[PDB]
Amino acid sequence: MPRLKVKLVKSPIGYPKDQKAALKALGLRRLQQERVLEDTPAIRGNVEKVAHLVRVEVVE
Amino acid sequence: AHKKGLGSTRNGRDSQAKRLGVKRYEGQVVRAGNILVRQRGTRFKPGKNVGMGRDFTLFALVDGVVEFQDRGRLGRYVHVRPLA
Amino acid sequence: MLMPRRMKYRKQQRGRLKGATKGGDYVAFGDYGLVALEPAWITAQQIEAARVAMVRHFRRGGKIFIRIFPDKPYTKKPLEVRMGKGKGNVEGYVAVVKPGRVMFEVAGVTEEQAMEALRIAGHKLPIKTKIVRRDAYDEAQ
Amino acid sequence: KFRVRNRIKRTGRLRLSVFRSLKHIYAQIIDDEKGVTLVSASSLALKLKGNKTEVARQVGRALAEKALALGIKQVAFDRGPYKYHGRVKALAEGAREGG
């Protein structure tokens, strides 16, 4: 399984609490936060839930 | 202002909603005396170590796990099977 | 006009009316037709107003059909009252009509006849409509 | 027309699925669930006798031994139109203990 890699692009303040629970499920702190990640449909869906606050790249 | 003849009603009366539904499903261990289906008419007919009471309510007789069944020309079935 | 004389509920809640006609844009009846453009109630008062203006303009005319039917209870509270204490009154007996629904159609008329007629008849209603012929409408029952 | 599942009032435990018809008596003892049967004994369909009531007697008791060969002890006489005139083979002495 390749490695996933994502940042945080769009502020958490004023959006659903579930999506923010995903943002905790990743570890996404403040704005501009490059994150090293592992691939799995679980975390994949977790991140797909925030497909707008987050920059996507599958660094291998 | 002037507020002439108005009126009243007769409908400020509601029935205290009683929590009804199905509690346990296939995948859950239910051990002897656990209600798992709340209903009024036979929405869920008993069976394999399943039980019914004085108000059409399914529960657990065994320490077994639930599962379901469909038998059209008979009804809807619940069978709580355990282990050999 | 027209409605039930005794249905099921004196009152019923307003509801939400978004769109899609639910069903009814073809024919099987008239040869020209009038079709709505907005999702609103049409009042049976306005309905019969159209029926009038229609058979009115063209006298001795043939037969016109109404696909719609005003069967919606409007809740009209008494005048000069106060908030709460009840509801409205079984007034404004109307029908739920959304865009693309054939309100009403003519058959046996003349070209320009059906034109000017349905033109005015539609000009009456609380909206604006489409004057349509009969060709594509074929099939769908 | 005698369904009611009298067999549901026999779903209690262990069956004896049978039927009577003019010439033959179909006295069968059946393990259920999988519906896997076991013990049959008939009128002249077992090549025994010709009067159902006598056959019954003998048959049940023959059937007794059959049951008593396969570790069988108790079931329940299965029929809705049974009426129960015993046929005092009544598969009671006939293995089961019955009545």
Place this chain on the structure above:
Amino acid sequence: YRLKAYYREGEKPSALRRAGKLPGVMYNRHLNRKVYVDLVEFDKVFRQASIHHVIVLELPDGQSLPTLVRQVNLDKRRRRPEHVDFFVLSDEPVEMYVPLRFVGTPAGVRAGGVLQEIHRDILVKVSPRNIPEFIEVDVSGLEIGDSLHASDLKLPPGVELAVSPEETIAAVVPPEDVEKLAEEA
């Protein structure tokens, strides 16, 4: 008559639509590919068709095949076709709607009266070897209140029937005037 055809791939209709191609499906007995045409000549030609006339779709695949229409789902909103179905023909007795041309000016007609257009298009079982064009319907002797139905219509030698036959194909109805302002009462 003649019309173009092209094979649909599986691209979302939204594009095919928004451009100018009219999306649809065709089939026969078991076959069921997906296709598309072009609104303008499709519209123009279909007027001279419906399930009354037979159509031909030539295709850049090496094969040109004719069909009849069937089931046309629409937009509802703004009223216009947005999809079509085309049943491929055969030669084995098929069932669909033959047009009935109204013919006759009797007593219901003339002396007021309006024809009751019930079934121009009627369900019949005709062998696709034969093609009933414009089945005449005798109005020549009918008066208001009465009607016409059943086997009374034209039953061409190469066409069989299977509806009721009871179903009233047409009738004559009374006109209106200021006499319904008396009804207004």
Place this chain on the structure above:
RNA sequence: UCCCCCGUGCCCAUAGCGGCGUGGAACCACCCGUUCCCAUUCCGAACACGGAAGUGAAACGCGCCAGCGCCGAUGGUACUGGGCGGGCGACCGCCUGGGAGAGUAGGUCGGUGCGGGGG
């Protein structure tokens, strides 16, 4: 191993209707006697107890047909998570995924294991 039937059960009508053709050699069913066991708010119809002659219509088992009945793809659309504009509202639009019934094609009068008898 399998054929025909009887007892039986499972799928839940694509298993049901109807029309039709066929079997009684073991069966099944009518039939048969109403003394005996036995029962009917009345009927030996029903349940019966005792059974020779007959029957295959009716009961049913198998077969052929769709007329009725049941199923219904596949295209497209409705409505909709989630995301984003536009309108005074009434309300309309786009992407991303989710995906009906309506109906057209067409499907279908059966699927099947335990036990028993004859061959």
Place this chain on the structure above:
RNA sequence: AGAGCGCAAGGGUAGAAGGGGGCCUGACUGCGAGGCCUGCAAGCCGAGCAGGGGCGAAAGCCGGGCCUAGUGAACCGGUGGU
């Protein structure tokens, strides 16, 4: 299954809960596994256990009624007993 299933309706039912007869009296006694429900309190469900009882050839059902409404903690006192 549109009948009926006391009463309002919902849900449900002719593989009975409906309607007919026979013996009866489990509107049982001492307990209650474990669950519904939930702010507390009150309400809801019941296996099994043991005493004995009724019907059933039996297998077996019975701790009131097809269910959801028909209800009032406690303080006080009546009454019979321990």
Place this chain on the structure above:
RNA sequence: UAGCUGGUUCUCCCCGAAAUGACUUUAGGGUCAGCCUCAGGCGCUGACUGGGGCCUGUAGAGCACUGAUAGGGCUAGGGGGCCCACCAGCCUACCAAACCCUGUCAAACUCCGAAGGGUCCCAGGUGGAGCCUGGGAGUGAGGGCGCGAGCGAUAACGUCCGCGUCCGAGCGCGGGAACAACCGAGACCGCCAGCUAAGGCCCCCAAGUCUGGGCUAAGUGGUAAAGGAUGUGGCGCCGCGAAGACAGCCAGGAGGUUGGCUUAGAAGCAGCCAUCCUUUAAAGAGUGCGUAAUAGCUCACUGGUCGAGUGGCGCCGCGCCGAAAAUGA
């Protein structure tokens, strides 16, 4: 006495709420749990999500229950007449049980039934997750926007619930001209350092009078409708036409006739029906004006001249009339 008003004093550090559910002589107070806090204990549990198993009747939609429902056809009975009795016939631009077809409607209708939520199972997920006992609280007028329903009138900066959030406590920040809640975005402090969000770049005020092509003539932009018009751009449709057309001009523009029917009269021409035939290249049972009705004028239609395009129907974008209230724009 005071369930009420009011005051309630130094510094910093850490976390951080509720403005509900139940019951109350209860409604602007209260006790119970919920949401916060500290101590100690228990360890990947928790939010979240992937797969799988099952519970679900809202939307839609359909019409099989049920009501309603237009329209036709059929048809019990019934309106009525002709017309008899052992009793029946028969007929209708009548009423209507039911059924068939034509479409149709619904929160308390439901054959189908999503999106979705729910919960168990395995999996990951280290976070002011979570569980468990224990002391301290406060909180129970909340409000806006968002969609989903009620109510109101499909009014209210109206109230009523639900999921969702911002305020409150974020009147600390930047857009929004100014504005708790619209957009953007979580402030330990310093900085005369770099990017960037929302909006924005002609100058306020920081940055393109950049680039390239479309629309409009109204200050539209710079906030209004049904509706209206030879406004302007662009698309499409059906004739007319080099056999000769749009338009202009010349001319013929006719006869039965005063069509019949009405009517004081109705003569193409105030009105019902109609719904022709002929002399001809062409001329109507007429299109307007006019008449007391005739008269006349007149368009239609067809040639003479002509010389190149013309007439109509629908669409899309932007506009214009529609468009008036009060200190000064």
